[PDB]
């Protein structure tokens, strides 16, 4: 019965609606902008570094709340997409792949054809197969660009926050259907 | 040798060509229309309920003959897509996800961009993470809309029927190639 | 530090740059043309047989260096796509599926919609479910068309060659980014 579903959604809504300053502190520390799209799983934060690089970090809040984290760094001009695995318990990152794309658009465009273009191109060897010194220098480069414990903490806590907001909107949409 | 393949296809064809009333009885009982597309894996049945809802049920005959069953219910206006897992031996269903879409088209359009749109949006939490009473009321709602043992029986038997027809057409197409 | 990454890439480049006749011997023996697209994972070889068939063989060099090998055989006019699994150690092939498409374009076009079209159509039953004599005659047909130990050897060695070239180009692109 639609009434029975509606009653439970109504009571769950009231409860669910019932640390922002930690988000603001971390984002402002690195001069991040948060790109927030309510209704979608992916969250994005973007900043510009002292050396003129643009750093994008993408994560899937539903996957989190090992997770896939995409760090894209550009200097139109070439960008490297680092696909990372983040340990949710440890707050640690591991490089899975690093792919040099000819532009930020090539790295990030969500169109069907842009995805196919990414699928077809070489993504570098398994990271574990690289020279150890190459592995290390790339990890230290990412670290120096803010891929660290503070970022992992933000990703975890912001994912918990956004997903709960997504859950609330979902409850609301369900309520409208079952009304 | 092409002749050797052709001989075996020819003999398999003759054998394979060598309960419809149960299909008709179940479909008519619920006032279903069957949407049958020969050559394709997916089968669709659709009906309108006493309360003016439209219920679509989709299943993949090749997967069946746990299976994925998509039940889409609409009232242009919002639709909820219930993604179910069906126990093939038991004839039982389990809710994996329920996603409210803003229209039937958004839920069902097979275009590349429509699929991408579905992939990007929030699909609700894991069903197991919902309040137990919410889980139950949604399951009972689906039951009341004909997601039951009779539907599971139809899905199993119709999948066996259609797949065998697909196998026959496949044999025929192979025969033409090897001629 | 970008300098530290650049140094290691520079030294790896110098080392990596530091049997072609076996490629030429096998390709020429079967009158293959190699279709080589630097920067992409997939390699393609294509020939025309004595009976006027066109045989395409596709493989993913990154997957190789069990691998997926697609053998497409045409006579505009219908083509059968054989999806094979190749044992990398044994140099042996196993048929996973054989799908008759109405044209080479339908079988091979890489567009988003062409992929969706392939995903939706019936792919024949599990190969293991076929009559044993049908399984055998299809395997012997592929053999007679050059799906053999020589082809497996080429696929393995050419995959090693191309992937290393892809690795070199990747190092070069990384060098440019970190400069």
Swiss-Prot record, chains A, B, C:
Miscellaneous remark of the record: Present with 4910 molecules/cell in log phase SD medium.
Assembly and interaction partners: Homotrimer or homotetramer.
GO cellular component terms attached to this protein's record: mitochondrial matrix; mitochondrion
GO biological process, one term: aerobic respiration
PTM annotation (Phosphothreonine): residues: 37
Phylogenetic classification of the source organism: Eukaryota, Fungi, Dikarya, Ascomycota, Saccharomycotina
Family: Belongs to the MAM33 family.
Section of the entire sequence shown: 49 to 266 of 266
Protein name from the UniProt record: Mitochondrial acidic protein MAM33
Source organism per UniProt: Saccharomyces cerevisiae (strain ATCC 204508 / S288c) (Baker's yeast)
Keyword set, alphabetical order: Mitochondrion, Phosphoprotein, Transit peptide
Subcellular location: Mitochondrion matrix
Functional note: Not known. Binds to the sorting sequence of cytochrome b2.
GO MF, one annotated term: mitochondrial ribosome binding
Domain of life: Eukaryota
């Amino acid at each position: 019965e639609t009434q029975r579903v509606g009653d439970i959604l109504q009571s769950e809504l009231k409860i669910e609606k019932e640390s922002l300053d930690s988000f603001n502190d971390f984002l402002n520390k690195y001069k991040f902008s948060l790109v927030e799209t309510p209704g979608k799983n992916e969250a994005e934060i973007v900043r510009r570094t002292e050396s003129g690089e643009t750093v994008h970090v993408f994560f899937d809040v539903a996957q989190i709340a090992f997770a896939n984290v995409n760090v894209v760094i550009s200097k139109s001009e070439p960008a490297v997409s680092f696909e990372l695995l983040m340990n949710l318990q440890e707050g640690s990152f591991y490089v899975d792949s690093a792919t040099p794309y000819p532009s930020v658009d090539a790295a990030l465009n969500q169109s069907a054809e842009a995805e196919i273009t990414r699928e077809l191109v070489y993504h570098g060897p398994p990271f574990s197969n690289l020279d150890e010194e190459l592995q290390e220098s790339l990890e230290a480069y990412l670290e120096s660009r803010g891929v660290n414990e503070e970022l992992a903490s933000f990703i975890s806590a912001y994912s918990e926050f956004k997903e709960n907001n997504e859950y609330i909107s979902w409850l609301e949409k369900m309520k409208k259907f079952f009304h």
